[PDB]
């Protein structure tokens, strides 16, 4: 399996044991959807780890009923136990309307990261290649940095 | 009936009384199955007497709730009261499962001693080695039957195990 937007500059078909059968195109398509979704979520999560620190936490409350404030929710893994769980349920609802609105069954465009977002799309198939591989490489670096920040918060006891 | 297993070197076809000796092949099959099963259960009982004395009682409890601790229980015609009633029930249940899982009855392979227990691994296409093992099983079963009855009597008269 080559040409599938996965081989980059400092690396090739990086599989110490990945793609164990070196086939099973259905498994590989599922893994492609998995990796692209993981990368997008990670990029967002690292983004949201480094936004509150470099740009002060939101000015509002985030909970008028529970008297919580944005400036009172700690940044990092501790926020999961501070954000009101109705808020996490609403985040789950947004994830649902973001996952179940458009189908992502195998074969469908949803199974290839094609959720019709565009906005930062391009025009030429080579420019398409550039944008897609940029997104994928940034997502891999994201995943790495996001689990790194997870462990930094877990061990150091704070955001950094 | 003088060509079957059993009949051996020390005594030939042994029949002081009138059992068999009148044909009745089915009756002989029943008696052979009875002899084999009795010899097996006997051999097991013989070991169950010798082992708790030669080595020692098991390192455990046998009743973690009641704390019987194996070794507290004596050996022979006196564990009948010490071993918990549910323990005896489980032992008899295992024996009943061994009896009913197989189908001892006329003709079927369970009526000749083959109870599906294929340990003591003996190979096919090598008879007269399977037959020697079966004859040894019969002889050891007979010896163990007489021995276990003698051990019963020894414990009963002497008041304790051996």
């Amino acid at each position: 399996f080559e040409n599938e937007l996965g081989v980059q500059a400092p690396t090739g078909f990086f599989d110490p044991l990945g793609l164990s059968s070196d086939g099973s195109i259905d498994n590989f398509k599922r893994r492609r959807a998995s990796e692209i979704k993981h990368g997008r979520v990670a990029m967002l999560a690292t983004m949201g780890y480094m936004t509150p620190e470099i740009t002060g936490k939101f000015p509002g409350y985030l909970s008028y009923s529970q008297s919580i404030k944005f400036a009172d929710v700690p940044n990092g893994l501790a926020a999961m136990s501070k954000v009101p769980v109705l808020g996490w349920a609403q985040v789950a609802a947004y994830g649902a309307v973001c996952e179940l609105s458009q189908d992502q069954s195998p074969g469908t465009p949803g199974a290839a990261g094609d959720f019709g977002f565009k906005v930062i799309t391009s025009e030429d198939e080579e420019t398409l290649k550039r944008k897609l591989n940029s997104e994928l490489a940034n997502g891999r670096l994201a995943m790495m940095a996001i689990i790194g920040l997870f462990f930094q918060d877990g061990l150091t006891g704070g955001a950094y | 009936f003088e060509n079957e297993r059993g009949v051996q070197a020390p005594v030939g076809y042994w029949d002081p009384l009138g059992f068999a000796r009148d044909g009745n092949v089915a009756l002989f099959k029943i008696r052979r199955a009875t002899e084999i099963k009795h010899g097996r259960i006997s051999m097991l009982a013989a070991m169950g007497y010798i082992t708790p004395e030669v080595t020692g009682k098991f390192p455990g409890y046998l009743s973690p709730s009641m704390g019987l601790k194996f070794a507290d229980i004596p050996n022979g015609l006196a564990a009948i009261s010490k071993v918990p009633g549910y323990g005896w029930a489980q032992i008899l249940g295992w024996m009943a499962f061994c009896e009913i899982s197989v189908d001892q009855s006329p003709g079927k392979p369970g009526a000749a001693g083959d109870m599906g227990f294929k340990a003591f691994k003996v190979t096919a296409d090598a008879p007269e080695t399977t037959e020697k093992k079966l004859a040894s099983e019969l002889a050891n079963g007979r010896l163990a039957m007489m021995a276990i009855i003698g051990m019963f009597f020894q414990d009963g008269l002497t008041g304790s195990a051996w």
Binding site: S24, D26, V85, A89 | -
Partner: protein, 215 residues
Amino acid sequence: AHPKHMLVAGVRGYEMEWQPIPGDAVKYPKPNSEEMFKTMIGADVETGGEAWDPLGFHKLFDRNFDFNMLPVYPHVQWLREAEIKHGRVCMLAFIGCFAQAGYHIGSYPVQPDWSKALAECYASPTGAVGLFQISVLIGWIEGKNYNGDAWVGMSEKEPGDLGFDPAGFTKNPDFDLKKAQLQEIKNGRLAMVGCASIAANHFIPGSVPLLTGFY
């Protein structure tokens, strides 16, 4: 015979109908049931190698045509679907019963006892939201795999065939899926027996002589 209309249930010439869901076309079920039972996964050595169904619960759907020509009793396909679902739910329930007593995850009230955790999480302001999320997720994964039509023996899917197989199973040339299905079914029955034992111990102490100290 009787005209095309006026045909309901016991009238001669009335083809059996099955349309419980408003929005789905009418389905006309054949008896089957016994025919599907004769070629059905299960029936291992533990019961003699034959399909152990005393009381004839798999034949009642065939007897529907004799009773009132109505799908009152489930098809054997529905029975296998229910058995599979019960087995999976009971596996999870047994693991949960023996994991909640030692582990705690969320902001739910601390209740190691399994018989009280559900109610105490109902009462929790930050437990009701979580149980609502669990309920909506279960409802999604249950209505998506609605089966339902297995009640009349036409499910178009083998029992317990939700859209879930992250590993390579059901696709590898090896790993005979018949043995895996038999293992799943038998372990599910085992888990259901275990859950029944847990309930009996909770209500009648000393019933199962291995969970005496358990909740």
